[PDB]
């Protein structure tokens, strides 16, 4: 059972794997089904849209923090700033998230601005039951898209202060590397009897 110059494979089929094969014959069906659900929810949900206002949020980790992404809900802070309590904001098609925190002003403001636009671009019918039919826009998401913030300008003046990027990286990496040793030298000499 080993022969030729072939790559070594790892095909995990030593269990009774044929008892666990899911072949999605129901792709087309579920799609239909899925679409019907949406038409139904739309109709049931009167003029409301099919989704809630979601906040901007900067994504986690070194890999994605370049990008900005729809968040879960809006932080008790952001809501307060946008001139409303959370209990109400929830009934007005706005998602609120008690566990997100604001450390970033640029994002915070973006989110407050998101809220002012929303508030101005919805209308909220009186509780009575007068119901002045108003036609549903289906997507809070499409109505208030989230764009990446422009971080500079296309062209600009070159300024070369002189001290190179590469060496700064190198040095920067270095200071960290020996930060503790240097401190141990600071301690050990502090005990200059």
């Amino acid at each position: 059972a080993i022969s030729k110059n072939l790559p070594i494979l790892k095909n995990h089929f030593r269990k009774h794997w044929q008892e666990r094969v899911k072949v999605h014959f129901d792709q087309a069906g579920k799609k239909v089904s899925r679409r019907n659900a949406r038409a139904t929810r739309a109709a049931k949900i009167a003029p409301r849209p099919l989704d809630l206002l979601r906040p901007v949020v900067r994504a986690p980790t070194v890999k994605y923090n370049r990008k900005v992404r729809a968040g879960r809900g809006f932080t008790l802070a952001e809501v307060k700033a946008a001139g409303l309590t959370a209990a109400y904001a929830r009934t007005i098609g706005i998602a609120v998230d008690h566990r997100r925190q604001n450390r970033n002003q640029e994002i915070f403001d973006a989110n407050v601005q998101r809220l002012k636009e929303y508030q101005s671009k919805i209308i909220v019918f009186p509780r009575n039951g007068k119901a002045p039919e108003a036609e549903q826009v289906l997507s809070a998401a499409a109505t208030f898209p989230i764009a990446q913030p422009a971080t500079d300008v296309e062209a600009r003046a070159v300024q070369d202060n002189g001290e190179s990027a590469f060496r700064t990286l190198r040095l920067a990496r270095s200071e960290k590397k020996f930060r503790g040793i240097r401190e141990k030298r600071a301690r050990e000499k502090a005990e200059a009897e």
Binding site: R20, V21, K22, V23, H24
Partner: protein, 203 residues
């Protein structure tokens, strides 16, 4: 309130007053039947943070279960297979003694619904538990927005399915890296990572 004092007093299980108390009670229970109706909680502060309430429809039951390992049944210790499986005697059982306790009373009061249960004592041979139960046909309960959930059929014998607090412990349902394996439910997630998924347009 007196419940704060009770709670604190009970964390001193080797304090003098408490082990007199433990001593006398553990003889009394042991005298009574292995499952017997309790008249009232002997730990009302424990009962009540665990869902109990002093209204008709709420029931307490005291039960004791044998301690120690699970001796693997099997005639004469014979195992009839590989050596890894030849043990008999240091074998442990994946449910807690508390679960056994819950199950054995839930069976005894099948009109009732196990809600929760709590430890009250032990000696070398038994652990002693009180199980707090609810009667979902009692109107006092069937009303009561807060408790009448317990009346829906999805909650028949929660103790038999690992849905009481002990059960969720042993099933290992908790968020995190420590619970990857069991968490959405171990057999379920096994089945998942061991299902071959084929699309009409093969990916």
């Amino acid at each position: 309130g007196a419940y704060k004092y009770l709670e604190e007093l009970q964390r001193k299980k080797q304090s003098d007053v408490l082990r007199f108390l433990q001593r006398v009670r553990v003889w009394e229970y042991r005298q009574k039947n292995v499952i017997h109706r309790a008249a009232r909680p002997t730990r009302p502060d424990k009962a009540r943070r665990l869902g109990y309430k002093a209204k008709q429809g709420f029931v307490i039951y005291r039960v004791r279960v044998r301690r120690g390992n699970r001796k693997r049944p099997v005639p004469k210790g014979a195992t009839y297979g590989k050596p890894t499986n030849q043990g008999v005697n240091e074998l442990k059982y994946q449910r807690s003694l508390r679960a056994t306790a819950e199950e054995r009373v839930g069976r005894r009061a099948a009109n009732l619904r196990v809600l929760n249960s709590y430890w009250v004592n032990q000696d070398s041979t038994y652990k002693y538990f009180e199980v707090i139960l609810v009667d979902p046909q009692h109107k006092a309960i069937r009303r009561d927005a807060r408790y009448n959930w317990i009346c829906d059929p999805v909650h028949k014998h929660r103790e038999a399915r690992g849905l009481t607090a002990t059960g969720k412990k042993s099933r290992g349902i908790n968020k995190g890296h420590k619970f990857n394996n069991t968490k959405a439910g171990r057999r379920k997630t096994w089945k998942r990572q061991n299902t071959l998924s084929l699309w009409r347009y093969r990916k």
